[PDB]
Amino acid sequence: VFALGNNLGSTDGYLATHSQIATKTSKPLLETSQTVSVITREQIDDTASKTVQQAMRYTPGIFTGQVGASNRYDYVVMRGFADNSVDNIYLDGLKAMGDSGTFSSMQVDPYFLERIDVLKGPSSVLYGRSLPGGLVALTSKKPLYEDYRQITGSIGNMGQKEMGFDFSGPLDEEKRIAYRLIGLGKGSDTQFDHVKEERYAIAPTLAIDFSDDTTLTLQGYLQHDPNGGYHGGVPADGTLSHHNGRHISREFFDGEPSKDDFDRTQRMFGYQLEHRIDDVWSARQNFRYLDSDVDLSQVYAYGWSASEPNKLNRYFSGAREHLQAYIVDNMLQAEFATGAARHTLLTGLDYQRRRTVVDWRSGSASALDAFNPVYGDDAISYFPDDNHTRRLEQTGVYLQDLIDIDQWRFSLGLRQDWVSVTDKNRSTGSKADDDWEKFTGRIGALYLFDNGLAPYVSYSESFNPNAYSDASGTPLAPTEGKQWELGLKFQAPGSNSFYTASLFHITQENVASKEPQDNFYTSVGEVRSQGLELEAHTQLSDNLKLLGSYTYTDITYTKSLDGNQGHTPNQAPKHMASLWADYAFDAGPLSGLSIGGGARYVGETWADKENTLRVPDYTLVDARIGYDLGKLGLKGLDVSLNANNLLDKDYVASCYSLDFCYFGEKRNVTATVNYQF
Ligand SMILES: CCCCCCCCOCCOCCOCCOCCO
Ligand SMILES: CCCCCCCCCCC[C@@H](O)CC(=O)O
Ligand SMILES: CCCCCCCCCCC[C@@H](O)CC(=O)O
Ligand SMILES: CCCCCCCCCCC[C@@H](O)CC(=O)O
Ligand code: NA
Ligand code: NA
Ligand code: NI
């Protein structure tokens, strides 16, 4: 039923049986030599996660707090590696292709997805450039071959309101052409004064069966965000502590209302072609093109002003960016036997190409009182403009073999990569132009016991182009990740329960390092991240689903010129844990009702790489109640009330440095109505 490039599992409540993310071909999680979590549509809905980042808050090895209550972009820190977290997202097989070094990172609304898979650790062997911590792969909704219709409505605090629809179905008498059309409109004042978020999006999709051997899928995703919510940060002095006498509200807005814009338009046109050649061979081509636009205009705080007492030193930052990008992945796979051994041999060739045109304005703004701001003084005092064109190109050739034999599952992969990047400075004339070729390998071995236990060991690699440069303005060499993972998976034969343990050790080399006086880097640092991840999904009866996680992460700088040579980076909790439970009353008095709840604990973190100051820990509580009106004669209609951060904690979710600390989201309460067919 076509495994190449599909998950092809089966899902039941919060638990899926298979995935494609570690292998690029459907494999049962139990027989897969990597740590892989999967978050279902149902999980996303039950926790009322507004955002792919928020949707990961019950998953071990993941930190969701990088910018606190900001929703503009999706920051997912994996296994301690925060440094280019916007780039961890892949969509229908293919990297998202935002440009991490500009304001043009892309955002996928969760209403368009059906699933989210997380793969832990270095993963370049099938994806090219990526992070040492791993990757997140989103799977979008697809056309259906029986008629389906949903309409959905939401109201909330902070002025939240959402409407959305989702029609799918067969288009022809013979059920070989199918559509899906998904639309939404969405808005929020946030917790923060004078800010809106706003989105309108629509996703059409056509699915065409060609002979008995081919499917073609045409895809669009048009999204427009006329407002970007909030993306500010404030000093730790006055947030984790008192500044002179005061404390700095979690509703505080560091900008100017008359100069705060964030307008993002993102359009994707894509296709997936699946083709069966023989009983042995399959091919598959995935492709997507992205044309984005960002206009941005903001005044933002950078520390206390040194001459004015209770006011924040502030700057301006404008941008107009046009990004155009494309990505294609070609795969050819064979299923054949050599004696006792089953082989699944994959080769493929991918190609990425990205151009981004960026006109950046900047300058200084009047200072602003941090407790009793007076807005209005929006005159900017401009610095020199800074205009660039930026291109990247990556090309990969890769080979994988999955060898099955007796109770062993083995895994081999190689990949050759070619990366070119170039920056034209249209303001000063100058040009950077640099290219690297990289080789990556992965090897895994798992053993599948008769009773449902599956120990596995795995070795694996990543590379990623370095964000930083040397004294001559040349980029540093790419960073290299290497990981040994040792893991244990369990599912009892009968049950719908699943358990996982992973011990891992990751090394990151070529990390940028600077002597504090210097303003240019050298690639001479190293980071080591090791820890333990536990994950439980339990069906305790037919009415009760549980998810449990625990995460121990010891990440430090094992080599650093900055003076931080045994420190833990910021945004890296030593401990995290979570627990979520949904109860659905079967029969009796409360039939149709559902209650669920959860708790998430995040340990203390450092505010700074110097480790001079702690961010306190926090436990947040989320809750829900739902009712199925099908019980009472209105089949398909149901209704829910959700609350995240039920106890309305103030807290600093994290800091990026002592100058930039971020508040966690306050209590968020959404009530929802869905009518199906
Ligand atoms: C279990 C108790 C809670 C159940 C409450 C169910 C009712 C849900 O109402 C939400 C429907 O409202 C959505 C309307 O939003 C858009 C309309 O406004 C236009 C804005 O210009
Ligand atoms: C109900 C959902 C509303 C749909 C929102 C999508 C907005 C996308 C803007 C696309 C504009 C270009 O296509 C027009 C052009 O080239 O001039
Ligand atoms: C086996 C045949 C492949 C099927 C056709 C797909 C070709 C994809 C074009 C990619 C362009 C790069 O190659 C350019 C390069 O960086 O050199
Ligand atoms: C059968 C396998 C054929 C493989 C074709 C490999 C082509 C790779 C060269 C293109 C790489 C660009 O991103 C950078 C560049 O070339 O400057
Ligand atoms: Na892994
Ligand atoms: Na938004
Ligand atoms: Ni616009």
Automatic annotation (TrEMBL):
UniProt key word Plastid: no
Subcellular location field: Cell outer membrane
Disulfide bonds: 655-661
Coiled coil segments of this chain: none
Membrane topology, as annotated: Multi-pass membrane protein
GO biological process: nickel cation transport; siderophore transport; zinc ion transport
Alphabetized GO MF terms: siderophore uptake transmembrane transporter activity; signaling receptor activity
One GO CC annotation: cell outer membrane
Major place of residence: membrane
Keywords noted in UniProt: Cell outer membrane, Ion transport, Iron, Iron transport, Membrane, Nickel, Nickel transport, Receptor, Signal, TonB box, Transmembrane, Transmembrane beta strand, Transport, Zinc, Zinc transport
Similarity annotation: Belongs to the TonB-dependent receptor family.
Described purpose of this protein according to its UniProt entry: Transports the metallophore pseudopaline, which is involved in the acquisition of nickel and zinc, and thus enables bacterial growth inside the host, where metal access is limited. Is probably involved in the import of pseudopaline-metal complexes.
Protein name (Swiss-Prot/TrEMBL): Metal-pseudopaline receptor CntO
Gene encoding the protein: fhuA
